[PDB]
Amino acid sequence: FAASDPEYVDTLFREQLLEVVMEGRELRKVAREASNVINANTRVGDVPI
Amino acid sequence: FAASDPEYVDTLFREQLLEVVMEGRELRKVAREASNVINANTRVGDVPI
Ligand SMILES: [Mg+2]
Numbered sequence: 001f002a003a004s005d006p007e008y009v010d011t012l013f014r015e016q017l018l019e020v021v022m023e024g025r026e027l028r029k030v031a032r033e034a035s036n037v038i039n040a041n042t043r044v045g046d047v048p049i
Numbered sequence: 050f051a052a053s054d055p056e057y058v059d060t061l062f063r064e065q066l067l068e069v070v071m072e073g074r075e076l077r078k079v080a081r082e083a084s085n086v087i088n089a090n091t092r093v094g095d096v097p098i
């Protein structure tokens with residue numbers, strides 16, 4: 001009837017797609033706080049104890 | 050023979066190569082003048098009528 005969005009839902013405009021994508025399951029990021037972090041200069045090395 | 054150009058055609062001189070490359074078949078290109086060009090934001094779309 002008249003002109004309503006249920007008729008022209010793909011004709012006069014598009015349904016919004018939100019610019020934000022909502023996350024999947026996110027696993028808990030802790031390691032950087034939960035341990036001492038060493039920025040190594042080498043892939044292999046040893047720490048003195 | 051004595052000294053003839055078909056003997057020394059690749060030894061005393063080199064055959065002429067004409068500097069103009071001759072064009073092949075050129076098709077008639079008109080669509081851009083002969084229609085309305087829509088620069089689209091998507092591959093698949095719709096136009097309202
Ligand atoms: Mg070691």
Ligand SMILES: [Mg+2]
Pocket residue numbers: 093094095
């Ligand atoms: Mg469509």
